[PDB]
Design a protein around this ligand. Structure first.
Ligand code: OV0
Length: 269
């Protein structure tokens, strides 16, 4: 039942490019009548095996469902046709309350992941999938690692805390910084023109590209941050800034954020 066979799997289309692999849509049809379920299949070496071993362990309402494996090994997951928040939000006017629900849902999945002693390492809107209108699922565990220790010794730098950029140490609290950035993306409706790379490169400029990471590190340590999104309530932006505390230990955990987001969700609903 965990094993899928190459002969009964037929390709429909490519879905995208993740960390250490391409994601493709297949229909898995043993019966030969298109009755069988549609599945997302990710394909590749050392780190690839790790993504299979990680996601095999994980089971949660807001983590993408592992279905099985296949001999090319390939990783078979549930298919979520609505795709990512990065894809979805630019075309669908979604209200503030729904966005906060998604935010709550991300933290519940991340709180689960951390309790299993894993860090994600690319928590970004491109890796948050919609199952349905009020159900996010976190995808792409290609950079995910098992914490040995308080951190893993290590790249999407515009989502990364100063300690990752400077000291090459990824903490549980580093994922919370990234969540802060993801929350910024949701509140801008994942608008390209307001994206973290666009905004940070406006602040840094591109006259000296060899020192992008240095200049990014320096501005963050100066206390400069991404602006408040249009129509974002002040309360919510403070929560963002709390996730972007320079000192990692002053950031809330994902367990701390859940009841806060529940209450903020209930306010604007
Ligand atoms: O269903 C899935 N099961 C796992 C998984 N992973 C990803 C994924 C990821 F999480 C991170 C990075 C890259 C990825 F591909 C995406 C994905 N569903 C997708 C659904 C629709 C489109 C699509 O039709 N698009 C997109 C642009 C407009 C056209 C594409 C992908 C799934």
């Amino acid at each position: 039942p965990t094993v899928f066979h190459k002969r009964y799997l037929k390709k429909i289309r490519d879905l995208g490019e993740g960390h250490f692999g391409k994601v493709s849509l297949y229909c898995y049809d043993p019966t030969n009548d298109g009755t069988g379920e549609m599945v997302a299949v990710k394909a590749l070496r050392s780190g690839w095996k790790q993504e299979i071993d990680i996601l095999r362990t994980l089971y949660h309402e807001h983590i993408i469902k592992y279905k099985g494996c296949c001999e090319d090994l390939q990783l078979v997951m549930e298919y979520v046709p609505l795709g990512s928040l990065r894809d979805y939000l630019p075309r669908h006017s979604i209200g503030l309350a729904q966005l906060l629900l998604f935010a709550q849902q991300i933290c519940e999945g991340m709180a689960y992941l951390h309790a299993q002693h894993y860090i994600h390492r690319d928590l970004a809107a491109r890796n948050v999938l919609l199952d349905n209108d009020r159900l996010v699922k976190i995808g792409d565990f290609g950079l995910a690692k098992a914490v040995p220790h308080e951190y893993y010794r290590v790249s999407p730098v515009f989502w990364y805390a100063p300690e990752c950029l400077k000291e090459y140490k990824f903490y549980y609290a580093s994922d919370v910084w990234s969540f802060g950035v993801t929350l910024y993306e949701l509140l801008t409706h994942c608008d390209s023109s307001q994206s973290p790379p666009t905004k940070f490169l406006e602040l840094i400029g591109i006259a000296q590209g060899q020192m992008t990471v240095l200049r990014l590190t320096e501005l963050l340590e100066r206390g400069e941050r991404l602006p408040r999104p249009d129509k974002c309530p002040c309360e919510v932006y403070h929560l963002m800034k709390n996730c972007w505390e320079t000192e990692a230990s002053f950031r809330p955990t994902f367990e701390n954020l859940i009841p806060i987001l529940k209450t903020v969700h209930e306010k604007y609903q």
